[PDB]
Amino acid sequence: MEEGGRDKAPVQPQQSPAAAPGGTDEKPSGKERRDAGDKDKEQELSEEDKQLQDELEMLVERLGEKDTSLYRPALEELRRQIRSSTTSMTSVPKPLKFLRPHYGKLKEIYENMAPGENKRFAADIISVLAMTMSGERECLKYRLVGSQEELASWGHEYVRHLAGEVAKEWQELDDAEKVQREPLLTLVKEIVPYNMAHNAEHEACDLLMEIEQVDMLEKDIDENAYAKVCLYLTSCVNYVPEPENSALLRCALGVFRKFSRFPEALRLALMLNDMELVEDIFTSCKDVVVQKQMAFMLGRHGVFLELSEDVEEYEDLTEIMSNVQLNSNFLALARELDIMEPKVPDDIYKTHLENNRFGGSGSQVDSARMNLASSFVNGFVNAAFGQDKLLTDDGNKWLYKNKDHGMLSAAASLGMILLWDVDGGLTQIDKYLYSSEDYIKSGALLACGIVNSGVRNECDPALALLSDYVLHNSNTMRLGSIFGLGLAYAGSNREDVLTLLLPVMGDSKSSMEVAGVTALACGMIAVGSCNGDVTSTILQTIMEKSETELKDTYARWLPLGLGLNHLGKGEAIEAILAALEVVSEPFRSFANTLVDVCAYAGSGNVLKVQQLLHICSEHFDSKEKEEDKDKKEKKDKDKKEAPADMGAHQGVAVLGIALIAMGEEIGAEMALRTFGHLLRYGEPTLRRAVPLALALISVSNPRLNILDTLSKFSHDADPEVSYNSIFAMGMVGSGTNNARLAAMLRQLAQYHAKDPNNLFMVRLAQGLTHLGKGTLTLCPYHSDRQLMSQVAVAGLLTVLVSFLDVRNIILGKSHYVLYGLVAAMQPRMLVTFDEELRPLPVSVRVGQAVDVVGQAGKPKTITGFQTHTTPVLLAHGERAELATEEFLP
Amino acid sequence: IDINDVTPNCRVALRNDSYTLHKILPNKVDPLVSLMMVEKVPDSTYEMIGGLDKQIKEIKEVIELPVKHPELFEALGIAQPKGVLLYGPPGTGKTLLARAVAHHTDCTFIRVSGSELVQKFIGEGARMVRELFVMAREHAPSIIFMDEIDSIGSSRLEGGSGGDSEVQRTMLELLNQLDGFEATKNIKVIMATNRIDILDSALLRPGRIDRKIEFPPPNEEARLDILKIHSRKMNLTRGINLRKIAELMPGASGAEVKGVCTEAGMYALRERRVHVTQEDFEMAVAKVMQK
Amino acid sequence: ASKLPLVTPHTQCRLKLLKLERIKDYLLMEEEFIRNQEQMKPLEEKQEEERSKVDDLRGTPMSVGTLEEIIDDNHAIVSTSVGSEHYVSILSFVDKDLLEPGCSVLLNHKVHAVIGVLMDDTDPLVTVMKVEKAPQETYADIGGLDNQIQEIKESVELPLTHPEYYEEMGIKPPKGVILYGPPGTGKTLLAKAVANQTSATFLRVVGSELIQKYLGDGPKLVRELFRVAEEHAPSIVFIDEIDAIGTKRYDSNSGGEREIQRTMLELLNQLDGFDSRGDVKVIMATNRIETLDPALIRPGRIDRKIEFPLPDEKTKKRIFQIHTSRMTLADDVTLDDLIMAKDDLSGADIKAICTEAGLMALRERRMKVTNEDFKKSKENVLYKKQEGTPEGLYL
Amino acid sequence: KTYGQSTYSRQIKQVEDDIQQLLKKINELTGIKESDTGLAPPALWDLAADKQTLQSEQPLQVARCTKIINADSEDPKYIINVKQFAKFVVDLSDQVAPTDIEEGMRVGVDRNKYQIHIPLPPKIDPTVTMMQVEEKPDVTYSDVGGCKEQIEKLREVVETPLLHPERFVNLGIEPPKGVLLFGPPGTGKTLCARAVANRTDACFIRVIGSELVQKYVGEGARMVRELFEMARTKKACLIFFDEIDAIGGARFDDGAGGDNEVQRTMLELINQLDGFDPRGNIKVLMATNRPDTLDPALMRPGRLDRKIEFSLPDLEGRTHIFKIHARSMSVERDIRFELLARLCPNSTGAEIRSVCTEAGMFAIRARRKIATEKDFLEAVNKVIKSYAKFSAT
Ligand SMILES: Nc1ncnc2c1ncn2[C@@H]1O[C@H](COP(=O)(O)OP(=O)(O)OP(=O)(O)O)[C@@H](O)[C@H]1O
Ligand SMILES: Nc1ncnc2c1ncn2[C@@H]1O[C@H](COP(=O)(O)OP(=O)(O)O)[C@@H](O)[C@H]1O
Known about the structure:
The structure is cut from a larger assembly and holds chains A, B, C and D.
Chain B: E1 12-14, E2 21-24, H1 31-34, E3 39-40, H2 53-68, H3 70-76, E4 83-86, H4 96-104, E5 108-112, H5 124-138, E6 142-146, H6 149-153, H7 168-179, E7 187-192, H8 201-204, E8 212-213, H9 220-230, H10 242-248, H11 255-270, H12 278-290
Parallel strand pairs in B: 4-7, 4-8, 5-6, 6-7
Antiparallel strand pairs in B: 1-2, 3-5
Helix pairs in contact in B: 5-7, 9-10, 11-12
Chain C: H1 14-40, H2 46-57, E1 63-70, E2 76-78, E3 104-107, E4 114-117, H3 125-129, H4 147-161, E5 176-180, H5 189-194, E6 202-206, H6 217-232, E7 236-240, H7 256-271, E8 281-285, H8 294-297, E9 304-307, H9 314-323, H10 347-363, H11 371-385
Parallel strand pairs in C: 5-8, 5-9, 6-7, 7-8
Antiparallel strand pairs in C: 1-2, 1-3, 3-4
Helix pairs in contact in C: 6-7, 9-10, 10-11
Chain D: H1 11-30, H2 51-55, E1 64-70, E2 78-81, E3 87-92, E4 106-109, E5 115-119, H3 126-129, H4 148-163, H5 167-171, E6 178-182, H6 189-198, E7 203-207, H7 219-233, E8 237-241, H8 261-273, E9 283-288, H9 296-299, E10 306-309, H10 316-325, H11 338-343, H12 349-365, H13 373-392
Parallel strand pairs in D: 3-5, 6-9, 6-10, 7-8, 8-9
Antiparallel strand pairs in D: 1-2, 1-4, 2-3, 4-5
Helix pairs in contact in D: 7-8, 10-12, 12-13
The complex binds adenosine-5'-triphosphate (ATP) and adenosine-5'-diphosphate (ADP).
Adenosine-5'-diphosphate binds at residues 141-143, 183-189, 319, 322, 347-348, 351 of chain C.
């Protein structure tokens, strides 16, 4: 140990504690200069920060920690020229003995010294062993002070300026890879008053250079998903002026400003339309902004532009936002004729050419339920102009023969076969509107609704044909006749269809399934804040539910609609008007939970999630209260999908352990629909864990405890190699058993993975993760599922086509001004970069370089090359445009 | 039957239809303990063997002094050696010096044949170096004598990528049990070998082995001593004048002296006598020297 | 097992603090439920019926075998005890994650379908060329090389113990370190001293072993050496005396003298020729520099070129301090004058001095140390180091 | 007492350290079986102890595998052997038609009646399936810049016929299915190989150059046979060879008792490359550092048609390699790279990558988050001095 001797540090820096007690008095030269002769040396040796151990970092420290109390207050000459070391043992020689924030108490005294080290000690202080003290003193001292001691003792007045100059210095010094420290220091400082210092940081970035502004922005999108509720209400509005005022990118913001649609207010939800209106730099870049306000998340302002032919290119902007013909049908046609096979003559259900030779002979099943399921299968995969005229003649003969439910569900085949072809599809459906069968005519009305789903045509052919049937008769044909208006006009808000469908909802009619399907329409015609529909729904509920103690059909559809009125924006202010008045009868704790913790989509508030299991865990209920925990289980499907694999693997960790192996009834019957609502693309974890509790049929109860799990397990779209599991599951549930209650549900549940050829989008996360309706429509598809007693009598009609919210899953086009290009793209996996060196590969999946304008499936991030700038959105999701001139070959 | 009595390598009976353990048959023997390396009371020469006097002093100062003086090594702070390597032409005090050293150091002498009869059951060598050392740890303060065969058994780990024939692993097993933790204790080893430059003594140098002692071809005095030793267990005439036989042939190794005695017994047997005469030794020297 | 991939930023970044705070809420909600699960249904039926059912579902004679190929996700072709191969079906109580072509699986006695997989015995190659534990103690026994320790500290230890600095500015750590110097200075020694402060396993190979008399086992042994080291851990491979093989290629004359060029080209290709292996750190010790292949010398395979000079007197005091520490010393013997006029020794010779200076005292049965013990040890070790070099003409 | 990394860098340790053992507490509180001599977790074999194994036992028999040798006419009547049991004459079952039942592939046979049930893929030894790459490294062509003419030559050889088989049909030419790469070491041959395997739209098969040199006689010819048969089975694969001097370029006879077996392997390669029904739509890439001790049969075109060379860049390509290698860094936007390329006259891409790593080494040696501008300038000047010394010795 040669530490000592040759270095000055044990001799002269330790002789230096001899001039504050013995040189303050009687030595005006010795007041400072006796100390200053080694003190300027210490300052120079401390600004040069290369070693962990400096000759004054640990050597004088041993007397230094008591020198800050016995010597520095005994200096008694504290001036501007003493700010060389006595401004610096906190942002320079930190002490050895660390008792939590002991330096938090030391830097109360050193806070007045901290403007001494403002400029020469600005550079190397957000590095080395000084930024811990700087950030932690700022955060903890502002936590202690806040704003109650605003004018009291400078704990808000100079602390704001110090944090502002530190945040300025963070990019003044280096613009390093710790740019995200700048939100962090503005985070713990000012948790609640956050807006002032964050707007100070925003004005600093207004002074900053305009190319770094991307990365902190996605850091903001990193924190605008799960921080805290009141922190969403300020962070999502603190996103707003940054790419709008500082930068002028003006299209990468509006794709990521629907996060602030629901939590803040409807005013900010429409100020996207407002500042898209008031911004008028040429035409193309704003056309990219309204290309997703078309119909990709929510149309909304798709009838809000025209005033007196004032907006530039109004007629083209309206043709885009309406999703109508050449911006949809043409494209799908332009793929399906030119990249795919337009035949698809039910060969997915005709690929089992090698199964009746397996195990003896065949021709044993004679049940009249396979016909409907095969009809739905062949009418399911023939989407996008695969019109099978004179092929549904088996369905035509089954219209007049049997299966009135099946006769209704077969007439929707032509409607679900010309999806989005509003102009051509009506001419193909017309031939059925004059049928002598109410089932065929009702199915043709439902087909007219299905064709218009997600397309706003100026001629309103859905409203104009379905209107006359809404109040047609008191029986079943009374029931289904509303449903087209329930489907084609569910993403908008117009009063005319609302007062159209209101009188059946408000006449106290005692046919409960009619009331339920009208509630399933009218509670989600507008997913907004319509209080009149809320009052109509709740009054109509308290109009027949109270004087009974019977089945879940009472809660099947009407409280589902009452939840759907404010679902997706339920920040627990819907509780006090909805749930608090409906605490009348106890048999529908299903419904009470359904309207109580209805709430909203994937967000934070994990205390609500643990409320959903902590109180009502199992409770050993004797088949009387488990439906409350059934709903409270399907509420756990939400709060996990939109956070983008945050709690999704946590979700499958919980209910793949806690409930599937230990549930008495719920985990074995109802808790398996979550695999269809949480995820839809399928990976070998969950798509293989689902048959692990499904290959066992569990015939102790009725066998449809497993058929619903089969439908939810094969509910995943996007065609795959799952044919082996599908076919083996078909053969273990084949004509050996061929159960009639699952005879149609078997064939439905086997071959619907390759549902459409490529339009497999049911994810409900557009761009990156924003929701975009759909879940409101997806909820009756798997929430109405209660095993049997609805596929035959009442309940199948709601689960027919309520999931039809596909939104053009094609991931390749150009749309070069007026579609003047083909382009060469590069599909590659999810965004693996969050925070490293500033440019990076976005993902690692090579790219599989394909010129052909094809789909990407769900998990992808498709970038461009060939020097085409991809100038329009900077978010790589395929919509349109892709302009030119990178001035580079 | 009980689970705990089932050990590795015990013969058991399985039933005909479903293989269930019927009865544990008794084992026959442990193969190494059947052929066990014979412990002898060491019959030394009483150190009269002239010519190897330099080898006597070297083996004294090299291997005896750690056994007799732990205090000297502890006071000087020198780590006590473990092994001693011997090399030279065959017959020139291979096993005789080890026997004389073992008897004069008050320790028993163990000789390990172990060439290839052990390795017939391929991995028996992996237990051969185990149990032997166990007896050399449990019997007394003693030495272990081991021949060239280990170098014949392995050179290095070129058979690690070649196969090891489960013999180099044996060497590897010996390696850890040669390292172990002894610090003399009560077990020491002496290596006698020929052709030293095939094995892997560079890794064996730190700690495990130590200084090596050469051996020359024998002089006349050591030749007469070898002849007097090998003429012990033989019914011979008095007045044989073994010095005359020692000067009778000019120069040879020590291995031919044994053949001299056996074919001298042959020529004595052709005389139909229990005697072994001088002329038998003269014709013995002539016939053996001829070949 | 795969709790979540929740580490994006690799920095302070409170979202990581939030993500770990978000991950605990699902964990505490699980332990709350399972504690409430056990008090209501304590029946461990998984070990009661299911474990008893499979034990009778599996045949009581289990016939072992060898896997050969996995045909699909439900059927795999296996071998049998002697010659026959089947097309049995893999079941679903067998783990398929460690199911590999080569490990022994076990079949039933009638259908021969594979039930499971027996535990694979570890390779014997690990047991032989491992350096075992610390062959020498820590850095207190080595002398003064200072910056030589420093470069290996920041290239082998610093990426291992603290991998929280290299990724901060996103620079991959350097791969190869080469140690060169005069013959006996610190070469490998230092390499044994670094193989006690390391965390992962250490594999030592020697270049004298890296020849084979059979044409073909040369590059196969090099390939199998790195394959074992890669699959285990973030291990470190030390090729001692690598300069024996990869010296030059200009001869190209027939025999094994060109086979050495062929057995080094595989090492050159496996070091960095295609899809460079993660978390394997190489270290190479040579005696010479100029007779080396320049394709090894180029970066991408070795970067840290380390020079080992001979210390003249300063650390030689500390080398003598270390070597004479665990022994006696008298007042008459002092080591300063023995090295005062001499400035041409090495650290192997100093240990050769100190081991032999204790050998005169034991062989004469004398006192502990004398001064003349050190005097004649210096003269004889000089005879051992410099004996017969024909230099009367000073070049 | 201690020292902290960054702000609250110590309570993060506790909050992720307690939950990691609390997961183990969760696992033991549930009760988890550990190492059941080869088995599955109880939430993972829950369908194994179910009717899934009963459907996996009753219909599917053993169907023991066999090899076919000869087929008869009209009636099928296949001659067959099992592996070592016996040889038989058998028929196919009614479950499969007699079309994909040609000679020389393994077929499954029922153990009772001895009838053919289902064909299997042919036997490929595992030492040549491992060298099939099965994954693609991500090396964009933008990462191999500075070598524009060589890059576009390799592009117009390989990528154009495999993506545009329209130009060559109407122009009536044939592409050069063999291209050799050569130059100084560390110049980008490996990078060009990875760049080819990036966007290949095909199957890529890599070969270790010393893999074929084996102990027994004649087995390397078997590797070349199985390799080219695997190439012929799929459509449009790409063979990559590296370090071709190990396979063999010399033809020595000066007392020819040295290498002869590797000459036989080279000869079987040389034959399978060209002549008597050639391979088809496959391409061959080769790379070596000494293309002067090679076989004149190899250098003959029809097997090797381009000799693409590499060299010490220029002055501009050093700046390009700087801009593509040091872009993944935290440096202030003030570094000039053309001066740094001026200061290093003769260097490879590996040396530039080593400059980029030593920049981070300077950034880590001092306690800095980044490599600052003057820090980068001092770092590059010190490593230029260091590389002058390193090229000296
Ligand atoms: N033009 C280049 N652009 C970018 N990096 C390059 C370039 N040329 C070489 N490099 C770098 O050089 C490193 C090492 O060279 P490389 O692996 O290509 O060797 P090589 O030319 O195949 O030589 P050898 O096979 O003789 O070792 C690569 O990892 C790569 O990053
Ligand atoms: N600085 C030192 N401190 C302690 N021992 C040393 C030192 N330098 C050399 N030695 C000794 O010199 C010997 C030679 O080391 P090394 O050069 O790695 O082996 P080789 O000469 O066989 O390559 C080692 O056994 C070591 O004990």
